[PDB]
Amino acid sequence: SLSDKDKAAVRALWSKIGKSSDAIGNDALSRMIVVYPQTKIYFSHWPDVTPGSPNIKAHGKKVMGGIALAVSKIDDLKTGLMELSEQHAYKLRVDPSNFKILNHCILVVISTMFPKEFTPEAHVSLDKFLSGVALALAERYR
């Protein structure tokens, strides 16, 4: 579970990198699609699922929007992301094993763009935060 130190770290980091959220989302989705090809099937209904495509750039905004929501609902991720969990489990039917994949790509992207700010201390807290986000999204699966 996230400690107050963890919540402060995530809010402080988000405060710094949030401005580039559109770029982070686009880059993170691009990588997941290229590095982990099995995820492609979920976006097969899009005409262009290549890096930097208009569909991916657009979705990257929505994904980072979910992360920003998680940061604001940091004190209770289960309740905060309930609708997203229901959506991924029932409407989208996204295999829950993929959440950990995207989380990793998000960390890589943040690392490539904010090397100075993405310290190991910001990393442990963000990693715990993303695990909580993944756990919250998995809530409605069973």
Partner: protein
Amino acid sequence: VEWTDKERSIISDIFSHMDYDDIGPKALSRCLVVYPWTQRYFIMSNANVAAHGIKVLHGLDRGMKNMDNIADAYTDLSTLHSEKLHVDPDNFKLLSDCITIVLAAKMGHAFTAETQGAFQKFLAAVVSALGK
């Protein structure tokens, strides 16, 4: 495994522009901070951690030089870490991710998705050889 000429070039390029004394220590340090339970086998300023960090990259170097025999190149180390050191296998994957994140910070935008892919495949191959 099946390597493409492109993968061989990328991996070769990554290693030739990688400063082991910089990447090794940073990757291991990060791992001990992000996954604290690996601290038991031994943070930023600890020379011993730095030393082993360098050794890890040098160990990867060996596999980069003979990419076709990755499995047999790690027999001595697989047994050392396993039988002697008793490192839980799951920890190889944790370090691998930290190495990836540290390299990403150094390379910045040059660490493209394609570069990440080749590198992750390379590390996946090494990790398997270590848990072999």
